[model samples]
Target: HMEVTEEDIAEIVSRWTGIPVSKLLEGEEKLLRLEEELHKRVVGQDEAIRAVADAIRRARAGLKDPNRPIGSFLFLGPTGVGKTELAKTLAATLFDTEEAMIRIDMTEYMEKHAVSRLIGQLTEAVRRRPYSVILFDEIEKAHPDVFNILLQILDDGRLTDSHGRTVDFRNTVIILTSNLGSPLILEGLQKGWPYERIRDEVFKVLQQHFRPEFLNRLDEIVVFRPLTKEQIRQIVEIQLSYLRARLAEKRISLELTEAAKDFLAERGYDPVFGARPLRRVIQRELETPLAQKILAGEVKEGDRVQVDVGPAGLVFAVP
Candidate 1:
């Protein structure tokens, strides 16, 4: 008689769970490449990416507290700097869909009455999707009561809903995003200070905003650095891939000249607001023109559309 191995068991479980067999069996290999995968979506912040990946790997390897969530992190950074994008990316990467993330904008909870409803919304979602990414956006604005509830989740990996049912969080990833130390980061960037020094200063500023117990319970406090010009250029290419795929569906090919790429990259560069501006730049300059060409029948199916920088902006031509 043949003997069954762990791989055989994992394949069976994966089929039942609708999870890929490779993800279940080859988890170690996946953990090793976590940073690389995260980088594909999150543009810069190499240090923050590595820190999150390592903490997740530790949890998955059974080296961390079993009672807590997989990892609880506080992401501190300026707006539009891939903070929220990283959370969305983690959801897509590990859970296979961005919808696996439960995003709660804490701005609504800044007032006391709203926090009561916030708790219900959170617990209900977690009860429905036990294993998911929970993002507390703009966490610094959360009320004291909201922090108390988070303390329970971070400590016991569980929450009791309004219905008094226990909702488990052990399989989930907890992320809190804040703009607390953005001013320091911006000033440090202008002063030519190193990341470590700026990060240390930012931590100092962050501590004054949160309780010691709340801060101590976190697995990591990740400080996201501003995106560099070169990084933004790379992001331009990455964003273009999606547009290329959409055009490919209509038997159309899309190409961008080096000058056109450089022009958009330069126009989109802003230290305060990261790659968010690039999307608008592409839409207004590249997509709008291409879309017009298609509508006017100047560009058609099975034709290759080439984009080059004109004296004013992007000029689209089919050749």
Candidate 2:
């Protein structure tokens, strides 16, 4: 006889409702720790995390208007400052997988002719995976018609596709990410301008780029703060965790000394690029050599490896 487990039941419910089984199974306690969970992947942007978590909490608690989407946010900041990362984290945390995020590069929808194609693809995606995060990257590059589509989704929580089938967006979270005032943000932080002042300045610019009605419908306009040196150090640990987990599968343990961490942070930190280059720095300076050593039997399974910084760069040894 075939037995049906709770997981199986959950999967069926998930398929039918478009809600991920993990989200359906999680308790209220998880919601309380939402900001903490988001921080595990995203380094800084405390205000952005708090605003996103609050909106999710409100929607989950049935305190929001049921006719509207779970949340709609305009994430304003420089590149690599965790705007997209936060959206990916939200999808993984709330929808069970990062793949649950449907990313649309607004640059691809800049032409008027691309409007139908954009709406069609977006509608189809939401219709299939209703419970997911919809990320609009570089929203300022999108055409005016794209904003019309967004206005419909934001105002009515639904949109009629070209085929006349209406798609519901009430279950999804909408995140529009833009590098609109990135230079101003970076300059403001460097000039010691208060965050409130920076935010006001950025909003003044946003009002010029977007229509007042479009901006008014959003639940929050989150300004991601530029990364600090310490935050970049924290990001190094988060990036290393992935590498550590991969090594752990082969019965190997990996440890990084504080000096090595600081070394990577120093090399990875870029005032203009944010933490974007950190991954490549780790890969080139650490992973590349580590892989060669492992292949040459210098490092092996059932061994603990320690990484420290020498004058030249990272030093890997068994200790």
Candidate 3:
């Protein structure tokens, strides 16, 4: 068992990013940090963050065992629910670079020929190199013809390329997210279905799609809960907070009127695209021309951009 102090993390980020520890310690500078930013944007997904963070901590600590986790996961559940967002957030935060993410749309590999395309056709040549994540988006759409290849990867932590070379899967993490199973569960929903009933049905449909053997290979299988009206509102508020933080960096202030705050709360309660509602509201109520005004050096310490929307009664967001 090992414990890493906060100072250790600060030192590591400093070394990796070429940012001085002193600069990072300055007031309002913590907003630029990954863990702090995530704690703000991602709501109630602590366990997911911990799972990914553990892998990061271990690797940063130079753990001798690269294969300890060898990234493997099954992210199950609804659309716009943070499955892919969490994975992408980790890629950006952990490496401090976006290149760490390797996204493969699973629909492209329907044909058996596409199966070995990723690992190289030759087993002998493929053994020369190993890589990281091979994200399979919408993996359920992959034709069953390639399941055998997947089975082999799971069975031995290796994949044979077209040229007959075996690729080492030891250090790579494979994450698969799906939405195909949602249809069955949605069909079972009553007219204005009960929340618990829909969730239960979704779980059952998920179980029916994958075999136990296939599911067993994953180190962690997380099922993200569907966001409710309240969850959606929270997500929007967080987005507003992010904007505020960004503005604070420039010593600018945005006044959130009472009317604008109520408008945002009700408008962002839409559960369709999570925080997407903010993009529109922000644009119409604030972003478009006013954002350009702010960026063009209109901000001062006491300068405030007023945001008021809807029937003047509800206030959505205030800085």
Estimate, for each residue in 146-207, the C-alpha lDDT of model 3 and write its tens digit: 66676666666777665665567664556788775465555655356777877777667667
Leading candidate by TM-score: 2
Ranking by TM-score: 2, 1, 3
Tens-place lDDT per residue, model 2, 1-319, is 2697778889999888767987887673799999999988888889999999999889888998899899999998778889888999999998999999999998799879878987688998998888889999989988888878889999879988888888999989999988887778788989999999998998788888877778889999887788887788889988888899999999898888989888988878776677889899999989998999899999988899999899778889987
lDDT of 1 by residue, 1-319 (tens): 2598776787789668855444565454787888998898888899999989989888878899999998999987777778888899998888767888999998888777865685589888887777689999888888888778889999989988676778899878999988887877789889999999998998787777787888889999887877777787778899899889998998898888888888999877676676678888898889898888899999988998888999979988877
Off by over 4 Å in 1: 1-28, 183-205
After the best TM-score superposition of candidate 1, give how far the Cα of residue 98 lies from its true spot, in angstroms.
1.4
CA lDDT of 104 in candidate 3?
73
Worst ten-residue run, lDDT, model 3? 121-130
lDDT ranking of the models? 2, 1, 3
